[PDB]
Scaffold this active site. Sequence first.
Site, PDB file in Angstrom:
ATOM      1  N   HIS A  45      58.017  20.107  -7.104  1.00  0.00           N
ATOM      2  CA  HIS A  45      58.515  21.050  -6.098  1.00  0.00           C
ATOM      3  C   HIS A  45      57.436  21.994  -5.612  1.00  0.00           C
ATOM      4  CE1 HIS A  45      59.522  24.113  -9.335  1.00  0.00           C
ATOM      5  NE2 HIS A  45      59.169  24.939  -8.356  1.00  0.00           N
ATOM      6  N   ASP A  93      60.742  16.348 -11.762  1.00  0.00           N
ATOM      7  CA  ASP A  93      59.971  17.444 -11.147  1.00  0.00           C
ATOM      8  C   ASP A  93      58.577  17.470 -11.762  1.00  0.00           C
ATOM      9  OD1 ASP A  93      59.211  19.551  -9.556  1.00  0.00           O
ATOM     10  OD2 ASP A  93      60.515  21.051 -10.571  1.00  0.00           O
ATOM     11  N   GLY A 186      56.703  31.329  -9.351  1.00  0.00           N
ATOM     12  CA  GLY A 186      55.250  31.382  -9.489  1.00  0.00           C
ATOM     13  C   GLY A 186      54.722  30.827 -10.821  1.00  0.00           C
ATOM     14  N   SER A 188      56.315  28.094 -12.011  1.00  0.00           N
ATOM     15  CA  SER A 188      56.632  26.662 -11.818  1.00  0.00           C
ATOM     16  C   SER A 188      55.364  25.812 -11.880  1.00  0.00           C
ATOM     17  CB  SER A 188      57.237  26.440 -10.442  1.00  0.00           C
ATOM     18  OG  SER A 188      58.496  27.072 -10.297  1.00  0.00           O
ATOM     19  N   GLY A 189      55.469  24.640 -12.505  1.00  0.00           N
ATOM     20  CA  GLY A 189      54.342  23.707 -12.557  1.00  0.00           C
ATOM     21  C   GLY A 189      53.425  23.946 -13.735  1.00  0.00           C
TER      22      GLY A 189
END
Length: 240
Positions: A45, A93, A186, A188-189
Amino acid sequence: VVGGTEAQRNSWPSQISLQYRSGSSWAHTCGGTLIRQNWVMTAAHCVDRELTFRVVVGEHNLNQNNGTEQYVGVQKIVVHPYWNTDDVAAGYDIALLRLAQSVTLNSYVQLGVLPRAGTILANNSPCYITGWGLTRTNGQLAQTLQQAYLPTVDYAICSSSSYWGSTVKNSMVCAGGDGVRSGCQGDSGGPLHCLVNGQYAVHGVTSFVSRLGCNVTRKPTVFTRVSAYISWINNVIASN
Ligand SMILES: [Ca+2]
């Protein structure tokens, strides 16, 4: 990271900042984990938008020179082919970014250790989330890398009705949910680092929190379970 503390500069050397170009400057949007000198693992995402991205390794403070940063463009973006932006709850994801140059390894820049395929952590296993994400729900990004202790919540508990129910899949890891500490926008990932047999490994890629807010009781932060994707990751790196 809500309820975090400032990470030491050399604690989490696989953590990267994924940034996008905005006018004449760059903006942090997500974290990621350096997994090869020229590959970063992040959330699908994070790269849905048609932006120009760069990766910063050896980053600690987003707003000042640390004397350790390496800045590299993103050459290829490989999103999991089953990812659907309309349905984060479906999972998948995860994305791999091939870097335009190979980064140099040192105390601040190291490859993340990944778990063996299929590995599942016992309930309440010790993990830290790290990132520069919002420090409060609807708050602002951190300047300095933050860490928060977020013990896992096993799939049985996490997918129960008072937690996330069927929204959580067995391809995900849940952690936290204490109402105080959590990932937030922020993060995320980025990595969830969990201690197993004396070694921290990256068991999660931060994926989502509640629409109600970041630190919400019985809404632990949800991560893509890295150990469900080892074959996929190996297959991508081998063919690109
Ligand atoms: Ca910096």
